Amino acid sequence: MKVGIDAGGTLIKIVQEQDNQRTFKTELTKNIDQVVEWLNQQQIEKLCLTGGNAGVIAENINIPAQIFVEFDAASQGLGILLKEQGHDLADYIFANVGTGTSLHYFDGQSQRRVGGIGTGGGMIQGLGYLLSQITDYKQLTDMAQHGDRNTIDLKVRHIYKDTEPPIPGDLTAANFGHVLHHLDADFTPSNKLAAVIGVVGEVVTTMAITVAREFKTENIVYIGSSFHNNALLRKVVEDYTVLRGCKPYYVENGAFSGAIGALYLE
Amino acid sequence: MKVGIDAGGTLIKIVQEQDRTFKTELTKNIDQVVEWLNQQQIEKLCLTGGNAGVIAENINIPAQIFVEFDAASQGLGILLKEQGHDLADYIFANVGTGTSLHYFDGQSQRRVGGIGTGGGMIQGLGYLLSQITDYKQLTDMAQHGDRNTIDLKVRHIYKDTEPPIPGDLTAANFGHVLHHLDADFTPSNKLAAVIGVVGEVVTTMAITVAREFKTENIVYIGSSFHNNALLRKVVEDYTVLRGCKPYYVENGAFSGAIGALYL
Numbered sequence A: 001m002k003v004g005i006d007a008g009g010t011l012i013k014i015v016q017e018q019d020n021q022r023t024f025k026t027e028l029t030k031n032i033d034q035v036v037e038w039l040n041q042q043q044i045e046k047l048c049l050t051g052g053n054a055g056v057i058a059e060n061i062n063i064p065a066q067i068f069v070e071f072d073a074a075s076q077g078l079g080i081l082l083k084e085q086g087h088d089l090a091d092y093i094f095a096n097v098g099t100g101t102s103l104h105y106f107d108g109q110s111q112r113r114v115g116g117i118g119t120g121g122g123m124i125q126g127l128g129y130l131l132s133q134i135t136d137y138k139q140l141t142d143m144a145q146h147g148d149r150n151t152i153d154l155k156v157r158h159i160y161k162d163t164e165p166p167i168p169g170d171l172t173a174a175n176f177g178h179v180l181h182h183l184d185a186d187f188t189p190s191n192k193l194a195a196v197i198g199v200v201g202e203v204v205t206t207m208a209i210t211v212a213r214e215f216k217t218e219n220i221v222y223i224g225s226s227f228h229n230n231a232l233l234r235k236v237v238e239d240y241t242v243l244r245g246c247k248p249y250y251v252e253n254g255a256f257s258g259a260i261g262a263l264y265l266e
Numbered sequence B: 001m002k003v004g005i006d007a008g009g010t011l012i013k014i015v016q017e018q019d020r021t022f023k024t025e026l027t028k029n030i031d032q033v034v035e036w037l038n039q040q041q042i043e044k045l046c047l048t049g050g051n052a053g054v055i056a057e058n059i060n061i062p063a064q065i066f067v068e069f070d071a072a073s074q075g076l077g078i079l080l081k082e083q084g085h086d087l088a089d090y091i092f093a094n095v096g097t098g099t100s101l102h103y104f105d106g107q108s109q110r111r112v113g114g115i116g117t118g119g120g121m122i123q124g125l126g127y128l129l130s131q132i133t134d135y136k137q138l139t140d141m142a143q144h145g146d147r148n149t150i151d152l153k154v155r156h157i158y159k160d161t162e163p164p165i166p167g168d169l170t171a172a173n174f175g176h177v178l179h180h181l182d183a184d185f186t187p188s189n190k191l192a193a194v195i196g197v198v199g200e201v202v203t204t205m206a207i208t209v210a211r212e213f214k215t216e217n218i219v220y221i222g223s224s225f226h227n228n229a230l231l232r233k234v235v236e237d238y239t240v241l242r243g244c245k246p247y248y249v250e251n252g253a254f255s256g257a258i259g260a261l262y263l
């Protein structure tokens, strides 16, 4: 058994490999203690680590472990999964949408971090909590799928009324920009949660299409756990990427890219 | 008397020249602006922005209408020169109800992006997190707010481990909320975090296109800065951290109204 772990701020991603049979496992970072305990019981041929909490794991385990930088690990695991799933992309931006978001340009051989932003999954949970008092992730994200953004968000055509706008009128002009025109409306947790995701989705995508243009690629690969159980977040990201003339790609087990990469390095 | 008006989604910016007067009125009160205009003797009336059409239809005199991007660019160059800046090139980030970003190459401008994180989000999300609707009050309240229990930093995730980017960077806006559920989230802290996120998104976008178009100059404008020192500081600090020069402009929010006049 060989093992790769991407110990992030919110989720611990574990890949076990055994005779080319692969296991994909998630555990909360909150429960890192139980991950360490599990590890100490196992017969492990090779253990590779990455992410911010790799150190916490490495210190509390009884066996050696190689530790890799998460940007390189994610890039390598993602290329392994892109190949396996029939994509041969000469180059691409990838947007690792986790607790926060890191953006990368892969030129065909290697990656470079070209930006990042703190709009990501951690904001969906945290701001989500402030607007709804829901702490359970599944519940939070389910509820948001049932949401309407029209009373909350302001569109380019809302500002330009009956004039020809100088950019497409369906574009979001101001996230939460309509709230003050609907104070005679009672803002439901679904609507509000849909608008949190709405803004997170549009910020990530905008950043991604911008660096796609800068590094002269049309391919944008979206990964990270922020997409699990959140179809609304995919749709927002997908629709807008397309609107901007770029190809969006999701990846089966994209959130484990870092755990896989750690396995297939050095 | 000549008049330029930038009728935005939230604020109507009026410049009167009689030779300069700078006046603001709420877009909600556009009716009173139209009434004021119909009483006046105006040699030339130039209009720009989204609500220009609403004004133009309800007035009882002619009016040239310009596209806001070209107007803002022209007015801003006038103000830059007047205030002693000779910038060969620059990004400008018009931070209004929403945010539009531009690259000025020394002779003309081009829109290189935009985002819906801006002043409208400060007000709107601000309202949702505090039930304050008054802008002055909302922004005053945010000013000494503390973000540390709300935002998550690179070093919080890389707890005792060398991070691969600077550890003081915000990693996740609102990303700490779930680690402080025992804590009272006060309206100031929460409002400081709204502005925090809006400031960091605008700046990130602006420094990114600054790099792309190989300029180190970033000029920030729009009314979103008025009575919000915290929003300037967040934007300013991070721009500097990224190796770019931030610039604010006296009456930068009127750039569009001025530009309409001189086109």
Ligand SMILES: Nc1ncnc2c1ncn2[C@@H]1O[C@H](COP(=O)(O)OP(=O)(O)O)[C@@H](O)[C@H]1O
Binding pocket: A007, A008, A009, A010, A011, A012, A051, A097, A098, A099, A100, A120, A121, A122, A123, A124, A125, A137, A223, A224, A225, A226, A227, A228, A255
């Ligand atoms: N089971 C879950 N519990 C909490 N968050 C989840 C879960 N599944 C998906 N998420 C979302 O994914 C995010 C974590 O993404 P991930 O890419 O694993 O980031 P990190 O590597 O920083 O832990 C969370 O902030 C949340 O939005």
Ligand SMILES: Nc1ncnc2c1ncn2[C@@H]1O[C@H](COP(=O)(O)OP(=O)(O)O)[C@@H](O)[C@H]1O
Binding pocket: B006, B007, B008, B009, B010, B011, B012, B049, B095, B096, B097, B098, B118, B119, B120, B121, B122, B123, B135, B221, B222, B223, B224, B225, B226, B253
């Ligand atoms: N007196 C005010 N009333 C309402 N909003 C204000 C005021 N002063 C500043 N603001 C802020 O300015 C933003 C509008 O910026 P502005 O550049 O005037 O854009 P627009 O052209 O879309 O009206 C508002 O969204 C709000 O954040």
Ligand SMILES: COCCCCCNC(=O)CCNC(=O)[C@H](O)C(C)(C)C
Binding pocket: A052, A098, A099, A100, A101, A102, A103, A115, A116, A117, A118, B154, B157, B168, B169, B170, B171, B172, B200, B204, B238
């Ligand atoms: C003081 O903060 C200035 C604003 C910084 C905002 C930009 N922040 C970032 O680029 C970090 C975003 N987050 C990430 O990249 C990821 O969550 C990691 C795990 C930190 C890599």
Ligand SMILES: COCCCCCNC(=O)CCNC(=O)[C@H](O)C(C)(C)C
Binding pocket: A156, A159, A167, A170, A171, A172, A173, A174, A202, A206, A240, B050, B096, B097, B098, B099, B100, B101, B113, B114, B115, B116
């Ligand atoms: C359907 O949603 C599209 C995703 C949001 C895309 C980006 N939004 C924008 O570029 C609009 C930002 N707003 C602005 O530039 C200004 O407020 C104007 C006045 C509308 C020009």
